[PDB]
Amino acid sequence: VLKGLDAVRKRPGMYIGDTDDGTGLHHMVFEVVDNAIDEALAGHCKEIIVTIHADNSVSVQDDGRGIPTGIVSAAEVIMTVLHAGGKFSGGLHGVGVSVVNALSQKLELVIQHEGKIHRQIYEHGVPQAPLAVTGETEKTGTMVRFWPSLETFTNVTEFEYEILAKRLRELSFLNSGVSIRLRDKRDGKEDHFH
Ligand SMILES: CO[C@@H]1[C@@H](OC(N)=O)[C@@H](O)[C@H](Oc2ccc3c(O)c(NC(=O)c4ccc(O)c(CC=C(C)C)c4)c(=O)oc3c2C)OC1(C)C
C-alpha cells in the first residue's frame, strides 16, 4: 500500500542501514546490483553495467530477461511492494528494490524485451504515470537509475567510487563468470571486474 512505503520512509535505517555514515547510501547501490546478479545466477544475464552520474545519480543496466511488463504491471508491483510475493547497522539483506524506490527522490525504470521498450518514472516511491512502451528494440534487459532522497540521507550524501569498486570487485570474484563494469562520469574512471 501507500502506507507500506510510509513505514519505510519513517524508519529507513531499519531497512537500509545507517543513514548518516555512508552505509545506507551505498547499500542503496548494492541491493539493485544484487538483483541483477540474481538474474545472472539464473542463467539469463551475462553483463552488468554500473554508472555514477555527475548529477549524483546511479544507474544499473543488465541484459537479463527484463522484469515482466504485462498486467498495474507486475513490474510496478516489484517496485512498490515490500517483499513482493514473499517474506524477508547494515539494514536488511535482500530488502528489495521497492525500498530503494521509496528512499529515492526519483527513480527511473527502463525495460526491454519482446521487441519493445517500456519506461516508468516514480517519485519517493510513487508512480507519476503508468508504465508505457516508448519505442522498439532488439535487445533485452533492465535499467534502474535513481536519485537518493535528501530528506533521508545526511552527512555523507555523495557516492564514492572507492566504496563501490571494492564491493563490485568482491562480487565478481564470488560469482565467477559474471562481468560487471563500473564508470565514473565525474572523471572518466572505469573498471571491469571479470
Ligand atoms: C528487480 O526485479 C527482479 C529481477 O531483477 C533484474 N535485475 O532482472 C530479478 O532479480 C528477478 O527477475 C525475475 C524473476 C522471475 C521471473 C520469471 O518468473 C519470469 N517468467 C515468467 O514466466 C513470468 C511471466 C509473467 C509474470 O507476471 C511473472 C511474475 C512476475 C515476477 C516474478 C516479477 C513471471 C520472467 O520472465 O522474468 C523473471 C524475472 C525477470 O526477480 C525480480 C523480478 C524480483
Swiss-Prot record:
Superkingdom to which the source organism belongs: Bacteria
Subcellular localization, as worded in the UniProt entry: Cytoplasm
Coiled-coil annotated residue ranges, if any: none
Entry similarity comment: Belongs to the type II topoisomerase GyrB family.
Function as written in the Swiss-Prot or TrEMBL entry: A type II topoisomerase that negatively supercoils closed circular double-stranded (ds) DNA in an ATP-dependent manner to modulate DNA topology and maintain chromosomes in an underwound state. Negative supercoiling favors strand separation, and DNA replication, transcription, recombination and repair, all of which involve strand separation. Also able to catalyze the interconversion of other topological isomers of dsDNA rings, including catenanes and knotted rings. Type II topoisomerases break and join 2 DNA strands simultaneously in an ATP-dependent manner.
Oligomer and partners: Heterotetramer, composed of two GyrA and two GyrB chains. In the heterotetramer, GyrA contains the active site tyrosine that forms a transient covalent intermediate with DNA, while GyrB binds cofactors and catalyzes ATP hydrolysis.
Note: Few gyrases are as efficient as E.coli at forming negative supercoils. Not all organisms have 2 type II topoisomerases; in organisms with a single type II topoisomerase this enzyme also has to decatenate newly replicated chromosomes.
Protein name per its UniProtKB record: DNA gyrase subunit B
Gene name of this polypeptide: gyrB
